[PDB]
């Protein structure tokens, strides 16, 4: 594993009364640790993982300040993108942002990230070089010039290489027991008569971390992609993850079927069968 | 830690 830290910003204009809402959440790998909501009566930045709480009050006053300021700016931005596209304040619109740093081998920036989207479709993004942008449309192009002349790119790189990398390492040491650790899937297989002459086999993977997993069914050497039913990886709600993989097989005949799971807490790719 | 505020203005879109 090569650890990373992400921040997700959601700005959203209101159709009714009220100012646009700014929600920020941050993650180290697949673990959330901080949240901020501008609806909260007196809005503050709050902890979301045990290991963060050791940080002094200076740290949280520092976060609040950042997000509060970001709320005011994202309200400006919305008006602007309302204009860029020529849209009434009738319609409700969403800006998203997703930025962070991936931690390479020498414990340094492998690559930095920053992507903006408007209404779920790609807007602007910092490139790999961390000094040029990618405008997806004519409106995004207006921002680019503005951002080139303001030299946002220079402030972005300064953070991504500098503090982002520095703080991720502080977090990675201070919660290491959970963050540096991989919890393997607890796997069992399941059987349910479809017919009459058929049955579903559900291969389970519970309580695992990180979310990265690979559940595939095999009748022989060739995959059962057609037709295996795979669900999206889901939260248990205690910080672990869940997933399952299913196929319909003839009630023969289940013998001929092996499940195969791949994780990061598994030394050898674990392989399973149904047991009557 | 999120990207902290710049010395200058926090540039919008």
């Amino acid at each position: 594993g090569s650890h990373s830290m992400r921040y997700f910003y959601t700005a959203m204009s209101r159709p009714g009364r009220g100012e646009p809402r700014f929600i920020a959440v941050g993650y180290v790998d697949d673990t959330q640790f901080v949240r901020f909501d501008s609806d909260a009566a007196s809005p503050r930045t709050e902890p979301r993982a045990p290991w963060i709480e050791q940080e002094g009050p200076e740290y949280w006053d520092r976060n609040t300040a950042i997000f509060k300021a970001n709320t005011q700016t994202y309200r400006e931005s919305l008006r602007n993108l309302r204009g860029y596209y020529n849209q009434s304040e009738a319609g409700s619109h969403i800006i998203q942002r997703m930025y962070g740093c991936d931690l390479g081998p020498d414990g340094r920036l492998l690559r930095g990230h920053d992507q903006s989207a408007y209404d779920g479709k790609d807007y602007i993004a910092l490139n790999e070089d961390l000094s040029s942008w990618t405008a997806a449309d004519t409106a995004a192009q207006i921002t680019q010039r503005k951002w080139e002349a303001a030299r946002v790119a220079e402030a972005r790189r300064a953070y991504l290489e500098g503090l982002c990398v520095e703080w991720l390492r502080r977090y990675l040491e201070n919660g290491k027991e959970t963050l540096q650790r991989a919890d393997p899937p607890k796997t069992h297989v399941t059987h349910h008569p479809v017919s009459d002459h058929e049955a579903t086999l559900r291969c389970w993977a519970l309580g695992f971390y990180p979310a990265e997993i690979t559940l595939t069914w095999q009748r022989d050497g060739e995959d059962q992609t057609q037709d295996t039913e795979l669900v999206e990886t889901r939260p248990a709600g205690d910080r672990t993850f869940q997933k399952w993989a299913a196929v319909v097989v003839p009630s023969g005949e289940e013998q001929r079927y092996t499940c195969h799971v791949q994780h990061e807490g598994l030394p050898k790719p674990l392989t399973l069968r149904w047991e009557p | 830690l999120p990207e902290p505020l710049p010395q200058g203005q926090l540039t919008a879109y």
Partner: T-cell receptor, first 112, second 114 residues
């Protein structure tokens, strides 16, 4: 750019005066420096943001008031000859080639 | 933390070359460096800003800079010096964030004579 009043001032020991600084660039940060021969620019106080202040290197005898996001204020409640100096106000950004980040500076003499 | 300009007053005649030395001290990984000119006039005119993560080569006509991050120096160099260059020169170090203290050097007076 950043403006700064007054340009010159004369004062008698014990008296007050507020140097006013103003920035129109929407910058968060505002800084106060004195200049004294062969001493460079030493910080006095600064402001991270609206309604926030922090000591510098020479905060003695100096007080500040970050009024709003536009205006910083350097206040001398009791003048002293050792405060004879040129005072510059600073508000740095990233586009220095075409935006002025320093006030003209205010010449100040404190006499007996 | 620290910005040093060991040079106090320095003299050159027209057309001659000058290199104004400047050395910094930080524990930080990211930072940028200022150069400012103070003419006999009083005001401060911007010469250059340079980020720590930038390149090394900076030739901009007569005024030129050399930023060696390993030996923590940033040296301004005027070729074909003119009487007009006569000023006090300031090196400065700062962080990128609103909370960061912009720290100045002691300065250097350059007197270009004809």
């Amino acid at each position: 750019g950043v403006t700064q009043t007054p340009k010159f001032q004369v004062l008698k020991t014990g008296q007050s005066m507020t140097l006013q600084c103003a920035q129109d660039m929407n910058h968060n940060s505002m800084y106060w420096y004195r200049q004294d021969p062969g001493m460079g620019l030493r910080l006095i106080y600064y402001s991270a943001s609206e309604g926030t202040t922090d000591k510098g290197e020479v905060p003695n005898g100096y007080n500040v008031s970050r009024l709003n996001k536009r205006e910083f204020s350097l206040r001398l409640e009791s003048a002293a000859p050792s405060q004879t100096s040129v005072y510059f106000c600073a508000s740095p950004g990233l586009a220095g080639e075409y935006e002025q980040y320093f006030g003209p500076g205010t010449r100040l003499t404190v006499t007996e | 933390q620290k910005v040093t300009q060991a040079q106090t007053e320095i003299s050159v005649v027209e057309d001659e070359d000058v290199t104004l030395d400047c050395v910094y001290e930080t524990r930080d990984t990211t930072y940028y460096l200022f150069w400012y000119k103070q003419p006999p006039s009083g005001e401060l005119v911007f010469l250059i800003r340079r980020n720590s993560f930038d390149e090394q080569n900076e030739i901009s006509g007569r005024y030129s800079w050399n930023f060696q991050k390993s030996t923590s120096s940033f040296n301004f160099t005027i070729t074909a010096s003119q009487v007009v260059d006569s000023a006090v020169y300031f090196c400065a170090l700062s962080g990128f964030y609103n909370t960061d203290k912009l720290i100045f050097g002691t300065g250097t007076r350059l007197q270009v004579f004809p």
